[model samples]
Target chain A: HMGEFSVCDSVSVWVGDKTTATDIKGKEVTVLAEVNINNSVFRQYFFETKCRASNPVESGCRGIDSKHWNSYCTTTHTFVKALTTDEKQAAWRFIRIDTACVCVLSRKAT
Target chain B: HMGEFSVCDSVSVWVGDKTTATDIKGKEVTVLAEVNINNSVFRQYFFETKCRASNPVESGCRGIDSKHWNSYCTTTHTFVKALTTDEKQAAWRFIRIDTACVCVLSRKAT
Candidate 1:
């Protein structure tokens, strides 16, 4: 559980107020981009209409053509499986990740 | 090549006509359901319209709301890496897997 403890450190810190690497502990890695899913209340509807999985973690990210800013959320949090070659080749980069069900926007950091 | 070998060692296997467990070895496992993704020609369009990610590996499966029958493809095939705890509980149930692209559908077996 993220509340249990943060997995980040000073090295791989993200640029955000609610979350920061200082809260975590470990080596200092790179800080990837952070995604702010705003209208998550209507996430299903919004995803069905606008948010097509662009990150490599998403299905068909490799063989298929996509458009994502940073990472992807192909599946739900129940089973956050690992990444595939296709995702890496296409464009899926998530060094640090957390999934806490709340109104706040979740993010993906390196 | 799939034609060359099957991973089913009798103890774990799947169900299907074109794909049978006898072709494999060992014992018999469970036969999970499979969702056929046709009209993949416009998958993005179809996904954006209705095919919402239901599997756990898809993303947001645990610490959130979700509905699925079986399995989840969190990441792509390129980096078909190891499994995760969340995926094991949520919906991902893959004992054996294969990645072969062609004019046929690749299946996951025990």
Candidate 2:
């Protein structure tokens, strides 16, 4: 699940978690992913502390609305960084962009 | 991503893509898994044709609300069945339960 962060502390979203985070404008939201959901089974995924946004509608952007929840849709641009997990182990990553809001969490935060 | 299902057709939710499905009462939503996202790198993961529910809050149920979107949180029961992917190849699976809703799709449907 997505936990609290201090600005841009590096954190990971477990692959299955698909977590929604506290939204902020222009800042990348640290989303819950599918990695933490599994301990070892997830090594088959292809990522290195990076992630990208994809629309459930398969069309356009959802524009990061709270009512919309985790519906930050858009397939362009991805967030990338080095994590203690990625450095010490393997993991999957995606950058969920809500219009222009990109979130960041530091290694210490996770 | 989650596509339209004929009730419950065998489908694979690619890893990294935690797809949300069209919610129907008491029906199992064919969630997107991690295998489809990767051609083969995902073999490290574990699962057959099975899935389980998880809460973002890590507490209790949010129930299944449209306004709640894909936030159907619960971790008690799990949904399981066979799929063409699980039979023909390797894959990952999970069951996201909204109270008591369970979905099913025939292998031929996928």
- Scored by TM against the true chain B, the candidates give 0.15, 0.16
Instruction: For candidate 1, state the interface root-mean-square deviation in angstroms to 1 decimal.
Output: 21.0
Task: Summarize candidate 2's per-residue lDDT along B4-83 as a digit string, tens digits.
Answer: 11111122222344344322234334443555464653422112121243332222112112232233221112222112
lDDT of each: 0.21, 0.26
Against the true structure, candidate 2 has what lDDT? 0.26
lDDT by residue (tens digit), candidate 1, A1-110 = 21221111111222232211111223222322233347432110010011133342343222211221122222211111222123225222222233211111132234
TM per prediction: 0.13, 0.14
Q: Residue A106 lDDT in model 2?
A: 14
Task: Estimate the lDDT of model 1.
Answer: 0.21
| Model 1, native contacts kept | 0.00
What is the overall TM-score of model 2 with all chains considered together?
A: 0.14
Docking class of 1: incorrect
For model 1, what is the error of residue B79's alpha carbon versus the real structure, in angstroms, after optimal superposition?
21
What is the total number of backbone clashes in candidate 2?
Answer: 51
lDDT of 1 by residue, B1-110 (tens): 11211111111112122221111123223332232446332110000011123332343222221221122222211111222123235222222232111111112235
User: Which is the leading candidate under lDDT?
Assistant: 2
DockQ for every model, please: 0.02, 0.02
lDDT of 2 at A38: 50
